[PDB]
DNA sequence: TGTCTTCAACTGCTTTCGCATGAAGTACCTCCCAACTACTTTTCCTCACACTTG
């Protein structure tokens, strides 16, 4: 229950946390050591860097339901473990991600922090339409300047195998 | 003009001494309160049309 800059800071924070919860199920899910974990962490560290700069009263960050998986997606590609469609279907099928419902938090309290303008608009709003999902990845790459930072992006002779 | 006589209406009382065990007048209006559903609210997000090229 707070509006403005600090409302945003915790909106920020909550976004912070669920992604982390997302990542660890990621590790249990695939089991691809420190590596998957730390690359994902700095990726968002890098994402955060940008958010602070256009701060003042910049509230454009309200990253979407898709922003988080785009993050995990790009981090995975850096590593280049899998694929997108496969990942998405697997995730929906097993709810592997905490993606669809945002009640997890650890907030009970973050919830009450008045999901207000933001945190309420977090965790599970709706399912991806048309490019309502590849477009975000591009935006993340732009903010990220991801291609310079990470090697071999979108690759995978494994998607071909998956497909045949 | 004067005195006597009756009847009926009204006054006042008819154990003491303690526990009990207190309750209860109050109508007209109400604003507040509690409610169900619908509607509205704040912040955020993402795409779209057009113009110009050859």
From Swiss-Prot:
Notes concerning its domains: Although it shares weak sequence similarity with SUA7/TFIIB, displays a similar subdomain organization as SUA7/TFIIB, with a N-terminal zinc finger, a connecting region (composed of B-reader and B-linker regions), followed by 2 cyclin folds.
Record protein name field: RNA polymerase I-specific transcription initiation factor RRN7
Subcellular localization: Nucleus, Nucleolus
Signal sequence annotation: none
Organism whose genome encodes this protein: Saccharomyces cerevisiae (strain ATCC 204508 / S288c) (Baker's yeast)
Region (N-terminal cyclin fold): 9-117
Further facts: Present with 398 molecules/cell in log phase SD medium.
Family stated for the protein in its record: Belongs to the RRN7/TAF1B family.
Keywords of this entry: DNA-binding, Metal-binding, Nucleus, Transcription, Transcription regulation, Zinc, Zinc-finger
Main localization of the protein described in the UniProt heading: nucleus
UniProt keyword DNA-binding, yes or no: yes
Source organism, top-level taxon: Eukaryota
Record text on subunit structure and interactions: Component of the core factor (CF) complex, which consists of RRN6, RRN7 and RRN11. The CF heterotrimer may further dimerize to form a hexamer. RRN7 interacts with RRN6, RRN11, SPT15 and RRN9.
Encoding gene (name): RRN7
Residue span relative to the full protein: 94 to 257 of 514
GO biological process, one term: nucleolar large rRNA transcription by RNA polymerase I
Biological function: Component of RNA polymerase I core factor complex (CF) that acts as a SUA7/TFIIB-like factor and plays a key role in multiple steps during transcription initiation such as pre-initiation complex (PIC) assembly and postpolymerase recruitment events in polymerase I (Pol I) transcription. Binds rDNA promoters and plays a role in Pol I recruitment. After binding of UAF (upstream activation factor) to an upstream element of the promoter, CF is recruited in a SPT15/TBP-dependent manner to form a pre-initiation complex.
Entry GO terms, CC: nucleolus; nucleus; RNA polymerase I core factor complex
GO MF terms, alphabetically ordered: RNA polymerase I core promoter sequence-specific DNA binding; TBP-class protein binding; zinc ion binding
């Amino acid at each position: 229950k707070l509006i403005g800059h600090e409302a945003k800071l915790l909106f920020l924070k909550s976004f912070q946390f669920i992604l982390k919860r997302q990542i660890r199920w990621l590790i249990t899910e695939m089991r691809f050591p420190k590596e998957f974990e730390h690359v994902a962490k700095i990726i968002w560290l890098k994402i955060l860097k940008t958010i602070n700069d256009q701060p003042q009263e910049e509230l454009k960050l309200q990253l979407h339901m898709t922003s988080t998986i785009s993050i995990l997606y790009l981090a995975s590609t850096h590593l280049s473990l899998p694929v997108y469609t496969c990942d998405y279907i697997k995730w929906i099928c097993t709810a592997k991600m905490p993606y669809f419902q945002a009640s997890e938090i650890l907030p009970k309290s973050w919830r009450i922090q008045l999901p207000n303008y933001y945190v309420s608009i977090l965790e599970g709003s709706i399912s991806p339409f048309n490019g309502q999902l590849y477009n975000k990845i591009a935006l993340t790459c732009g903010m990220i300047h991801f291609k310079e930072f990470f090697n071999s992006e979108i690759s995978c002779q494994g998607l071909l195998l998956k497909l045949v």
